[PDB]
Amino acid sequence: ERDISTEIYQAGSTPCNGVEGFNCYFPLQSYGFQPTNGVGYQPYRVVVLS
Amino acid sequence: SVLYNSASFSTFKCYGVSPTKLNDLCFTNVYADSFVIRGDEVRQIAPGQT
């Protein structure tokens, strides 16, 4: 199953109501593929054959 | 629930534990370190900064 629609996640009290106020983090987060980091931060392409 | 009914905060971040999982799991050795800093230094209080 693939999830396309993203909504404002609520982490505690204060209802977000789709405005992102207090305790309303964003579901999508960026990575950081840079060669100046460590080994674990490097990108890895994974293919699953079922 | 005794933190969001009489005091408003600004930054709240729990590293290593989800903020919504503080009700089912127990705790051990609860230490509170309180201090006062500058607004431009709030980003410097995190495990892995400079």
Side-chain angles (χ1 to χ4, degrees):
Chain A
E1 181 181 2
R2 183 185 297 101
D3 191 5
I4 290 88
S5 60
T6 60
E7 300 294 336
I8 301 300
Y9 181 81
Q10 180 180 0
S13 300
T14 68
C16 308
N17 301 330
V19 85
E20 187 179 0
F22 192 80
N23 295 338
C24 303
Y25 299 151
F26 203 85
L28 300 180
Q29 186 68 21
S30 180
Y31 270 146
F33 298 153
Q34 298 180 359
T36 60
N37 298 122
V39 183
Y41 299 92
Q42 299 180 0
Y44 286 83
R45 298 179 178 178
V46 185
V47 175
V48 181
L49 305 178
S50 180
Chain B
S1 61
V2 298
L3 298 180
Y4 301 94
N5 58 330
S6 61
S8 180
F9 308 103
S10 60
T11 303
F12 172 79
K13 182 64 63 178
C14 298
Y15 299 94
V17 56
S18 300
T20 60
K21 299 297 298 180
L22 300 180
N23 303 331
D24 301 0
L25 301 179
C26 186
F27 301 93
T28 302
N29 300 122
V30 181
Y31 293 92
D33 303 332
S34 303
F35 53 91
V36 177
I37 54 178
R38 193 181 297 269
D40 299 70
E41 303 176 358
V42 186
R43 61 180 181 270
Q44 300 182 2
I45 308 298
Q49 297 293 149
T50 178

